Amino acid sequence: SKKPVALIILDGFALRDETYGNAVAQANKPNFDRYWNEYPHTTLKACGEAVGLPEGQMGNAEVGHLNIGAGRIVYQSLTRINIAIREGEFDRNETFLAAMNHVKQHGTSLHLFGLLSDGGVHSHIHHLYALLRLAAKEGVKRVYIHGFLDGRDVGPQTAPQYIKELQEKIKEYGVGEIATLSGRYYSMDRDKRWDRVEKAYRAMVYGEGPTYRDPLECIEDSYKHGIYDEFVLPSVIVREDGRPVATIQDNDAIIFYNFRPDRAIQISNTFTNEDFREFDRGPKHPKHLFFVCLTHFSETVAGYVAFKPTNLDNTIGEVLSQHGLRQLRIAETEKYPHVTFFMSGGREEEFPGEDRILINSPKVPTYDLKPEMSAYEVTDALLKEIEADKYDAIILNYANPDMVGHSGKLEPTIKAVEAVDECLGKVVDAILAKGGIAIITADHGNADEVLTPDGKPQTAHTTNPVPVIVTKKGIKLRDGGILGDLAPTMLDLLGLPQPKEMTGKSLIV
Ligand SMILES: O=C(O)[C@@H](CO)OP(=O)(O)O
Numbered sequence: 001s002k003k004p005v006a007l008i009i010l011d012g013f014a015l016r017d018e019t020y021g022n023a024v025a026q027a028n029k030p031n032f033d034r035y036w037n038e039y040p041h042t043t044l045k046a047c048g049e050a051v052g053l054p055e056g057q058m059g060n061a062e063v064g065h066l067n068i069g070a071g072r073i074v075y076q077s078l079t080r081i082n083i084a085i086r087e088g089e090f091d092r093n094e095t096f097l098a099a100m101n102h103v104k105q106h107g108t109s110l111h112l113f114g115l116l117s118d119g120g121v122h123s124h125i126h127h128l129y130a131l132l133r134l135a136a137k138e139g140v141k142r143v144y145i146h147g148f149l150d151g152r153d154v155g156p157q158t159a160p161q162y163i164k165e166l167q168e169k170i171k172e173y174g175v176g177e178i179a180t181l182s183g184r185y186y187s188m189d190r191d192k193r194w195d196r197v198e199k200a201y202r203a204m205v206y207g208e209g210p211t212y213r214d215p216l217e218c219i220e221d222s223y224k225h226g227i228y229d230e231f232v233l234p235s236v237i238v239r240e241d242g243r244p245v246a247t248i249q250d251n252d253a254i255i256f257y258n259f260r261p262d263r264a265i266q267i268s269n270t271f272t273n274e275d276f277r278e279f280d281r282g283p284k285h286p287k288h289l290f291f292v293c294l295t296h297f298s299e300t301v302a303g304y305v306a307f308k309p310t311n312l313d314n315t316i317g318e319v320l321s322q323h324g325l326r327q328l329r330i331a332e333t334e335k336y337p338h339v340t341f342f343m344s345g346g347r348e349e350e351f352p353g354e355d356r357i358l359i360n361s362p363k364v365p366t367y368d369l370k371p372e373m374s375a376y377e378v379t380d381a382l383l384k385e386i387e388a389d390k391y392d393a394i395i396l397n398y399a400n401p402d403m404v405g406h407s408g409k410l411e412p413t414i415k416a417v418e419a420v421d422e423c424l425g426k427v428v429d430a431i432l433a434k435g436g437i438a439i440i441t442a443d444h445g446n447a448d449e450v451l452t453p454d455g456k457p458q459t460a461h462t463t464n465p466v467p468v469i470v471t472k473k474g475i476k477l478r479d480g481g482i483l484g485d486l487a488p489t490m491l492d493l494l495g496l497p498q499p500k501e502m503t504g505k506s507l508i509v
């Protein structure tokens, strides 16, 4: 039948020499290793300019998957917006101005909300300072900030530094008041866990949740309970009279300064959807909100986009489609969006011939509680499909390393890696039996450093290079490649012509 070519992405699996806090190196990976010893391999740059990001910036699932599926260096939003601020164009943004014009003409309020850190994955605090300075320039009187605490793209208990810096800028620009503070767990969920979402929503609209006069005391009090940045309960900052600093009301304007869509869609829909059934918003639910998305989130969001998106044509998925091949995209909840939407270049609709399998991730708050996650069910489901001789190409993502690594815990991250390695063996073998080829790789680093030099949790990504194995004897892979070379390599294996849009180059010599 078919000799399937499979693209296998071991999420957050990177190569790093130091083995201290390196889950990847400490894990027993017989399968992975044997493939690395017995087949052609290399490494690829998945950070900075190589993937369309500023120099020094680390990579992540969105970037990685856009680039991997695009076959070219994809220009990222972070970079694009940093440049706008640099070139004096940010202040001339018609969407920002219209938002500020709105609150001024109708005398409502402007609210700014998003991740409060310099992680650069979902946002950057510097953009917020940019919106605050622009606001002061435009003469907006009432500006309120609703902060989503990080602890995931940055240190786990670094919120206080960001809060302190923000307070300095506030005083410097002369506008803005921190209204609420919520952990990204509740305000930026992407797993459709509406109870978490509702918590954040009700804090911002009804001033419901833990109340404090001082933002810093809110943080310190939560730490005392062992609850850090990422998981802090949506809290409300109150005034001297006990009233909330500010609640979101009819006709106010909202600028969500996040530039990555997966964790922004949910809370955005909660604010803009005329009909919302996931949960009851209650009778005061603010209506007529002038809503601004920093970048395109989804068509379901009844708002405006500051920076317009641009189609990426002829991504691996499209080429496969145009040539009549049947493709499958598969992963569990946590990375389902990446193997589908991002892999297809920011498109949600399946291509003709494209099949998708979604496997539910375990019902646990944090994955360090269940390292193997749902890796076995994914593998099972995939093996059946492989056995049926249905697909010409396959795109699989094992989310374990990144998900468990984000916990900053060494032992669980090792179990995760080993769980993935076991499954990987079963998958690559079955592929080989069908006479196909596999392309083992990753989208970015993480699991390779889940502890700081000092032995403390390291919850973020790394800048280390990712691995690449092509299960085909008799060939050689060139070095110095980048993720944008993977798509071309797959088309090479499939004997399909490479489109002009893909400015990348096959790794096969
Ligand atoms: O959890 C997420 O949304 C990011 C970190 O902010 O991780 P990844 O890029 O791997 O999805």
Ligand SMILES: [Mn+2]
Pocket: 012, 060, 061, 402, 403, 406, 446, 461
């Ligand atoms: Mn991650």
